[PDB]
Design a protein around this nucleic acid. Structure first.
Ligand SMILES: Nc1nc2c(ncn2[C@@H]2O[C@H](COP(=O)(O)OP(=O)(O)OP(=O)(O)O)[C@@H](O)[C@H]2O)c(=O)[nH]1
Ligand SMILES: [Mg+2]
Lengths: 27, 138, 73, 534, 49, 36, 146
RNA sequence: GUGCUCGCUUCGGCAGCACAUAUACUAAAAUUGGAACGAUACAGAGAAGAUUAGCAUCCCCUGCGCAAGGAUG
RNA sequence: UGGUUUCUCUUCAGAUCGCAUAAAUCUUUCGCCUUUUACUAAAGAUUUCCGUGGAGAGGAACAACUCUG
RNA sequence: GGCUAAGAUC
RNA sequence: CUCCGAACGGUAAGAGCCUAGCAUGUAGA
């Protein structure tokens, strides 16, 4: 969480080949 | 022990208060008895023996002596002083001194019959000092 | 603040976030708050190296993500 | 048949289909062609179901959900507004009650669906409209009053949903008569726009107002409630001297005097002391205390309620106690006296406003009896559809004639029936019968007055058309098309997704133009198929 | 209080009369239960919160 | 309480098939070439 | 009803009243009253006017407009795992303010409200019953109460 | 054991009538034979390969497997 | 005509059988993907389980209180 | 003894 | 803005010695 995660291109939630959940928590 | 109703039991309960307390203290001391001495099912024998004497005290006070009121009789059967099924089997003329309600079950025996508890000694064999393992006595 | 993951055997694996200068006695209180045992009966181990009860986390160089094999005493 | 509802194995009826239904269609003096209009949701389609439950022994009433049998379309049951009128023919007895043909047609009441009302009003005779007693007049009530009086038809108001004034507002009965008089003054005040019925004023003393409750199955007309009073050991000359319970005040001293004076300081009118006072009391006795004094009020009013009916909820027990008390809807005796002027006998201005003259050849011919006119005098004004959607069915009231099965009819079109005869396209109409809400009769003959569902003569018909026999017709003037009294201002274009299905959308736009009258599909010059809507 | 909750005094306090009341009999082994009009009227006052 | 009572209501038909074989092993003891 | 001091049927102050109610001119006795003066009447009215209007009216009418649990006069079995007690204000457009936690919690609770009713609506046929009742009829189990 | 016999017939009892008809891998037992890849001490995965591969034609263990994996002729 | 209950067992359930609602399987779809199971939810139909509804059969409690007619 | 890319093959 | 993951793919490979928590309830003379 030390990164700002806004300069990053679209989204990087988990880069470990296990993204079952597809959410960003705005809806 | 907690009465588990808190509903102001009527008259006659104080007349049967120390008698039922002595039977309840006997069963609680029998429940705290260790498993030593009893072979396999002999430890459950004082559990039914204290339960048989507890049902005989309420039934004699209601049917035989007829001193207790019916309102105190229904409060005693609801609080757990005596089982309603044990008093129902004793109402019939065919069974008045039955050992336990488990011995009267027809599906309990492997051969599909009754136990030795519900059998008179004159109709039985000559040499037999057997006791009912499920019920507890004859 | 390092996120030490006290990952023992048989499913007991929890995350424990503690300060760098925090002592190991404060870490066992946080590890017991996620595992459900007494903090006095928890012994942390890393290949037969039983940790002490008075040494800070900054002395062991336990960085973020440095997992520990939890055991019970 | 997953398009609309239909019959269910020929459901029975208290009226005989041959001894009573066949004889009523021949007698033109007892026809009573009516058409209900109502407001948007004033309980008109549900009220026709109450007449079915009073006539048919099909007990499927409002136990949990409603029993709207007039709305046959599946979209009408899902949306709940109804987009198609359905003619209903049943046997509603009067107070004497021998037999009435009761040619009714329940039209929807949405403001955009005014074209279906103008099709039914220009075809039927009776214009008995329903007003919700909770809201009063509305936008649909003002447009229907101007449309009915301009068509030279009758008028008879009926304050429906009268249970909302007691069970949903808790209004006092003294103020309820002041509110009910505000409706009748506003309805008669709105009726004073077309100055042609100044002697025909809508009033409950003249038998025009007919109280009812479509939600809870009640009827409190002045003729019917007096007959229910005299039946309960009254013997006080029902419908002969009981026409004084409006404005007059009864008094227990001088009990044989319905004077107009006010003896006591708190003594309301006779309507709020003999009619609305028990009606507020009977609803309060069942919905207020169902465990105490409920059989006491039922035995005092003479209502033998069984133990199974006593074990119901508060809503169906209120409807079952009212149905056992009132019973048959005898309130339409006032709707047969003040209204329903017996078509083919007293329908002389009806043919004068529909046909384009036709003096000495068709004016005296169509105003004559059913049989001896001869060229069948047919005029359809609504094109229904079957379960397949392809084969259409016509619907119209025969003015004077009888073409049963064999005789074909030249389908006189809208523009192809003038002195310059363009096309007729005559065909044999052999599948003509009488229609109901859900069931469908199978009749051979078809006299005047009744609504005939002619089949097979609807393919060269795109709008309200006429049908006459080609056996010597003198080519009279055809009927005028139905003015919808509302211009379809909204226009939405429609084009298929795949462009290869161009005649498939063109054939569907032609069939949709025959169903809805106001839908005038005008093909634009740019090739875009437009559709005008309300 | 025994002023507004009078018909629901003893019935709304335990689970054994909730299914085996046997007063205005309601199917003693937890069957279809039938109540009165002020019995459900005092019920709706507590459920309105 | 409602969600986790339904969790055991779905696992009670499940776990008899999940752990049914686990309690049973302690007493029972456990391409295109085909077309050519 | 705001308070049970008002009577059974009462003209509520939150009702737009009838303004005139004097459109007719009948200060003098009408000639229809003298015409109906030869109409006698001595019988009882259409209902027995021995009681009043109503005693328990405010409690009874409000119970009629009550929702599905508080309106039926015949209580069924209705298992404790079948009375949700949370969907009464879940599918109701609840939040007046704006919490960020309440928005997705109301959206997800309404999601499983639809999804358990959209495709999960079978006729629910079955053939078997009495699973644990077969164990009670065995020769080894025994029933008691504790 | 429970209730009754116009029984002996006292009312202390006896005899008869009616109901109740076969529980129990039987014991608080007797012995009988042994398994950690578990610690400790010894040396410490070679500091080095010329056939080029799979598919089907008999069983133990991990796992909940109508997924899967090791060993196999 | 004549019985309020309670427990056992025999069918069909096309009624929100359930005014509320779980899991697994099969055939198609998406996201991650690195071997696999545990994965995300859109459609449809097959079981299991939590339960229930009318109608005959056998026991117990006042069946006698006399219920409707 | 069959199917596998004259099975690829100096 | 608060959507929190678990196992397998992993510790080898062996030599001599040492000690343990376990299980069956028999027909026979
Ligand atoms: N509770 C109650 N509801 C009523 C009563 N009368 C009418 N309604 C309601 O009013 C609604 C309107 O009646 P509909 O059957 O739809 O007929 P309609 O008034 O012509 O309305 P549309 O069909 O939409 O044209 C019905 O659905 C009823 O729910 C009543 O007396 N009591
Ligand atoms: Mg309608």
């Amino acid at each position: 969480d030390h990164f700002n995660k806004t300069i990053l291109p679209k989204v990087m939630q988990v880069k470990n080949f296990g993204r079952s959940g597809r959410t960003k928590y705005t809806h | 022990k907690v009465k588990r109703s808190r509903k102001a039991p009527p008259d006659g309960w104080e007349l049967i208060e120390p008698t039922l307390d002595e039977l309840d203290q006997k069963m609680r001391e029998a429940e705290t008895e260790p498993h030593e001495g009893k072979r396999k099912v002999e430890s459950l024998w004082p559990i039914f023996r204290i339960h048989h004497q507890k049902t005989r005290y309420i039934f004699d006070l209601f049917y035989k002596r007829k001193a207790i009121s019916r309102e105190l009789y229904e409060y005693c059967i609801k609080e757990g002083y005596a089982d309603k099924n044990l008093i129902a089997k004793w109402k019939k003329q065919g069974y008045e001194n039955l050992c336990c309600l488990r011995c009267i079950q027809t599906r309990d025996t492997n051969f599909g019959t009754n136990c030795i508890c519900r059998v008179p000694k004159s109709k039985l064999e000559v040499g037999r000092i057997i006791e009912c393992t499920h019920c507890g006595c004859r | 603040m390092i996120e030490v993951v006290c990952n023992d055997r048989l499913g007991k694996k929890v995350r424990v976030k503690c300060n760098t200068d925090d002592t190991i006695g404060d870490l066992k209180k946080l590890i017991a708050a996620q595992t459900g045992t007494r903090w006095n009966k928890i012994v942390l181990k890393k290949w037969y190296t039983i940790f002490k009860d008075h040494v800070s986390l900054g002395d062991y160089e336990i960085h973020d993500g440095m997992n520990l094999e939890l055991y019970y005493q | 048949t997953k398009k609309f509802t239909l019959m269910e194995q020929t459901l029975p009826v208290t009226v005989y289909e041959m001894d009573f239904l066949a004889d009523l269609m021949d007698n033109s003096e007892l026809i009573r062609n009516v058409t209900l209009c109502g407001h948007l949701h004033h309980g008109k389609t549900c009220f026709v179901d109450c007449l079915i439950e009073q006539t048919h022994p099909e007990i499927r009433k409002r136990y949990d959900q409603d029993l709207c049998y007039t709305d046959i379309l599946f979209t009408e049951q899902e949306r709940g507004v109804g987009i198609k009128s359905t003619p209903v023919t049943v046997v509603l007895p009067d107070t004497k009650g021998k037999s009435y043909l009761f040619n009714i047609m329940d039209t929807p009441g949405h403001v955009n669906f005014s074209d279906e009302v103008t099709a039914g009003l220009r075809i039927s005779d009776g214009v008995v409209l329903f007003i919700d007693a909770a809201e009063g007049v509305m936008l649909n009530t003002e447009r229907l009053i101007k449309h009915a009086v301009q068509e030279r038809l009758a008028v008879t108001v009926c304050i429906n949903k009268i249970d909302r004034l007691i069970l949903e507002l808790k209004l006092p009965p003294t103020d309820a008569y002041y509110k009910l008089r505000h409706i009748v003054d506003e309805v008669n005040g709105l009726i004073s726009m077309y100055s042609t019925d100044e002697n025909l004023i809508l009033s409950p003393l003249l038998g025009n107002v007919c109280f009812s409750s479509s939600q809870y199955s009640i009827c409190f007309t002045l003729g019917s409630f007096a007959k229910i009073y005299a039946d309960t050991f009254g013997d006080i000359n029902y419908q002969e001297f009981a026409k004084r319970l409006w404005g007059d005040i009864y008094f227990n001293p001088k009990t044989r005097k319905f004077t107009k004076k006010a003896p006591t300081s708190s003594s309301q009118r006779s309507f709020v002391e003999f009619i609305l006072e028990p009606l507020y009391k009977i609803l309060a006795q069942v919905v207020g205390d169902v465990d105490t004094s409920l059989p006491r009020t039922l035995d005092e009013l003479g209502i033998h309620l069984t133990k199974e009916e006593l074990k119901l909820n508060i809503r169906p027990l209120l409807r079952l106690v009212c149905k056992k008390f009132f019973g048959e809807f005898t309130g339409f005796v006032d709707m047969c006296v003040q209204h329903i002027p017996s078509p083919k006998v007293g329908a002389k201005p009806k043919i004068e406003h529909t046909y384009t003259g036709g003096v000495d050849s068709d004016l005296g011919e169509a105003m004559s009896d059913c049989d001896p006119d001869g060229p069948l005098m047919c005029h359809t004004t609504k094109m229904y559809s079957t379960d397949d959607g392809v084969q259409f069915h016509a619907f119209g009231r025969v003015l004077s004639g009888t073409i049963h099965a064999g005789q074909p009819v030249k389908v006189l079109g809208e523009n192809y029936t003038l002195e310059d005869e363009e096309d007729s396209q005559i065909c044999t109409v052999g599948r003509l019968w009488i229609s109901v809400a859900r069931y469908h009769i199978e009749v051979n003959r078809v006299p005047a007055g009744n609504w005939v569902l002619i089949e097979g003569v609807d393919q060269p018909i795109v709008k309200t058309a006429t049908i006459t026999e080609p056996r010597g017709n003198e080519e009279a003037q055809i009927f005028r098309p139905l003015k919808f009294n509302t211009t379809s201002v909204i226009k939405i274009a429609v084009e298929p997704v795949n462009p290869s299905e161009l005649p498939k959308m063109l054939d569907g736009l032609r069939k949709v133009n025959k169903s809805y009258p106001s839908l005038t599909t005008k093909v634009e010059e740019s090739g875009e198929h437009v559709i005008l809507g309300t | 209080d025994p002023e507004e909750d009078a018909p629901v005094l003893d019935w709304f306090y335990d689970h054994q009369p909730l299914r085996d009341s046997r007063k205005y009999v309601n199917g003693s082994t937890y069957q279809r239960w039938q109540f009165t009009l002020p019995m459900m009227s005092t019920l709706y006052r507590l459920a309105n919160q | 309480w409602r969600v986790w009572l339904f969790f055991m209501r779905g696992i009670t038909p499940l776990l008899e098939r999940w752990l049914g074989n686990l309690l049973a092993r302690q007493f029972e003891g456990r391409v295109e070439s085909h077309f050519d | 009803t705001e308070d049970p001091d008002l009577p059974a049927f009462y003209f509520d102050p939150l009702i737009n009243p009838i303004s005139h109610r004097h459109s007719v001119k009948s200060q003098e006795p009408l000639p229809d009253d003298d015409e109906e003066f030869e109409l006698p009447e001595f019988v009882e009215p259409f209902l027995k006017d021995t009681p009043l209007y109503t005693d328990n009216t405010a409690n009874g009418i409000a119970l009629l407009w009550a929702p599905r649990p508080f309106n039926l006069r015949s209580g069924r079995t209705r298992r404790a795992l079948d009375i949700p007690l949370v969907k009464n204000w879940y599918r109701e457009h609840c939040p007046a303010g704006q919490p960020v936690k309440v928005r997705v919690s109301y959206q997800k609770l309404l999601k499983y409200y639809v999804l358990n009713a959209l495709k999960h609506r079978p006729p629910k046929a079955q053939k078997k019953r009495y699973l644990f009742r077969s164990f009670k009829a065995t020769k080894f189990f025994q029933s008691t109460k504790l």
